[PDB]
Design a protein around this nucleic acid. Structure first.
Ligand code: ZN
Lengths: 12, 82, 264
DNA sequence: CCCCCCCCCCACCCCCCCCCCCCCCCCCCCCCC
DNA sequence: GGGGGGGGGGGGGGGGGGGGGTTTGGGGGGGGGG
């Protein structure tokens, strides 16, 4: 699998 | 779903449910029970759709600037529509 | 002290120069505070510019975000001071006349912008300053001899109670008429006519104007030119010239741009 | 007064920069005292 | 129950490679001569 990270708009 | 004809398809969904709520508690067969459950899942899903998270590959390093924007909406949508 | 006389000892001192303004730039925006917005979390922060350097935040300020290189400069939410640069010339009066006058650039700031205009003889008081200039803008490399400028902190050019007291006098027509040129023969119909030319009439916008126009005829062997010279000194914003060989465009406006002539 | 002239205006090395790789440090987890 | 040691992730430094850095003609304005 592809090592990756999630960026979330709700914490704006 | 929310916009079209003031969301008249929502009344279509409740009418489809009403046409098995009319019959008796027992007369609602497993198919009728399932149909009511699927109508609830429809309303649940329509509430539940929400913009996705911008998910980035971390093998390659960051440039001298970070992500340009987290906005993941399609061009024909504004957040107020959602 | 003269513009020609400034030397390396002055380079951080306050100085004061007399000179002639040749021309000025438009107002130039100078960033005093930078404004940085986070691309991830939309948080904003402000940075005062230190010696012309943006102290950019390397990571986002909010500890709950703290993403690196995520801050970006929102140009039109930065805060700007005003700057203007003016070319100030050594006056042709003070030069050793066999060789050219010098000139010096001066920087003038905030509401001191546009305190003077082309053709103004002024004093400017300011810190003398020097800065290096790049050999190529793509590089840090600097040329050894610095540019110099004066960074100004002050500028200078070159009531009714009294007026009411004179207004009651009975000889006032002749009193004002004599005053325009008491050194010249009294010719007081000419002086009275000129006094009315200095008063002027009134105006109406619906065309006509409240002007007055006079022609001194008579011999070339009389003092009328000297009267004109004094009236040109007396008036606030006049001009003096002469008509022999005077071009219709030279007197008025001439040619790219059109520039105004003597009458205009 | 009219026409012609003439004048103006214009069209190979070194630095900065970026990418790639390796090491070191710091945290977490497990074991030992 | 706390501290040490082992193991894995993440960040920073250092090196290497690459790209960039004046004449001639024409029209119109302006001035001078017949
Ligand atoms: Zn942030």
């Amino acid at each position: 699998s592809f090592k990756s990270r999630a960026l979330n708009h709700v914490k704006k | 779903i929310l916009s079209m004809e003031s969301g008249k398809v929502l009344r279509a969904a409740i009418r489809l449910a009403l046409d098995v709520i009319k019959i008796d508690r027992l007369s609602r067969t497993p198919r009728d029970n399932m149909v009511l459950k699927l109508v609830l899942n429809f309303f649940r899903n329509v509430i539940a759709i929400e913009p996705g998270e911008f998910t980035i590959n971390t093998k390659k390093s960051m440039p001298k600037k970070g992500i340009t924007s987290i906005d993941t909406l399609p061009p024909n949508v504004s957040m107020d529509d959602i | 002290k003269g513009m020609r006389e400034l030397n390396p000892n002055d380079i951080d001192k306050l100085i004061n120069l007399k000179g002639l303004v040749l021309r000025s730039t438009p107002v130039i925006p100078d960033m005093k505070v930078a404004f940085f917005k986070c691309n991830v979390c939309d948080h904003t922060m402000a940075v005062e510019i230190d010696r012309g350097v943006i102290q950019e935040p390397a990571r986002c300020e909010r500890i709950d975000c703290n993403e690196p290189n995520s801050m970006s400069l929102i140009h039109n939410r930065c805060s700007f001071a005003d700057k203007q640069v003016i070319k100030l010339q050594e006056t042709p009066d003070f030069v050793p006349d066999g060789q050219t006058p010098h000139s010096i650039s001066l920087c003038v700031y905030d509401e001191l912008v546009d305190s003077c205009r082309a053709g103004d003889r002024i004093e400017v008081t300011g810190t003398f300053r020097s800065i290096p200039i790049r050999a190529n803008s793509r590089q840090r490399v600097l040329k050894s001899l610095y540019k110099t400028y004066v960074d100004v902190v002050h500028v200078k050019k070159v009531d009714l109670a009294k007026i009411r007291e004179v207004a009651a006098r009975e000889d006032l027509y002749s009193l004002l008429a004599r005053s325009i040129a008491p050194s010249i023969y009294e010719l007081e119909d000419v002086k009275k006519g000129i006094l009315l030319q200095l008063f002027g009439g009134t105006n109406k916008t619906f065309r006509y104007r409240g002007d007055i126009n006079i022609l001194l005829c008579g011999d070339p062997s009389t003092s009328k030119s000297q009267i004109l010279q004094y009236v040109h000194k007396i008036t606030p914003r006049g001009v003096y010239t002469s008509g022999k060989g005077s071009s219709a465009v030279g007197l008025t406006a001439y040619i790219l741009v059109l520039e105004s002539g003597a009458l205009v």
